[PDB]
């Protein structure tokens, strides 16, 4: 139905599939007899790898930011002594 | 060259232009700023990063499940579990 098609698209968009990938998934959807699991899995797996890569990138930043946070007292203490500034002057490892 | 190095490091952590601007002001006039200010800027960015990680991990878990159930071979997509899952959500 029209509602089911939108539901299909909605679910794919919720997983972050690109316009290109959703178009391909839709093509498979209405013409499955001429497509395979290798094609559908490839679409999913490529998106999966991009998501995991982005998570790892963010986690690296998360760890550095966490280290920056943890070393600072976070009070009225004069910034002339702030470890955050010292760290950023040296690098981005936190 | 140091100001540019500082900015580079801040950029590597994803700080916004606004946050970098605030950090630079603290850096140049530290005697009139506090650790509370610098830590707040760090926490705002850290929380933004953690929020995005959480959103992505949610997608990752679902995608991983879709991946694992499919044979990924010449098997006709008429039987594909990925398409079935997408229909259901
Ligand atoms: Mg110290
Ligand atoms: Zn302090
Ligand atoms: Zn500090
Ligand atoms: Zn299969
Ligand atoms: Zn399949």
Swiss-Prot record, chain A:
GO biological process, one term: positive regulation of DNA-templated transcription
Keywords, alphabetical: DNA-binding, Metal-binding, Transcription, Transcription regulation, Zinc
Binding site for Zn(2+): 72-73, 77, 82
Leader peptide range in chain numbering: none
MF (Gene Ontology): cis-regulatory region sequence-specific DNA binding; DNA-binding transcription activator activity; DNA-binding transcription factor activity; zinc ion binding
Subunit structure: Homodimer.
Purpose: Zinc-responsive transcriptional regulator of zntA.
Identification of the protein by name: HTH-type transcriptional regulator ZntR
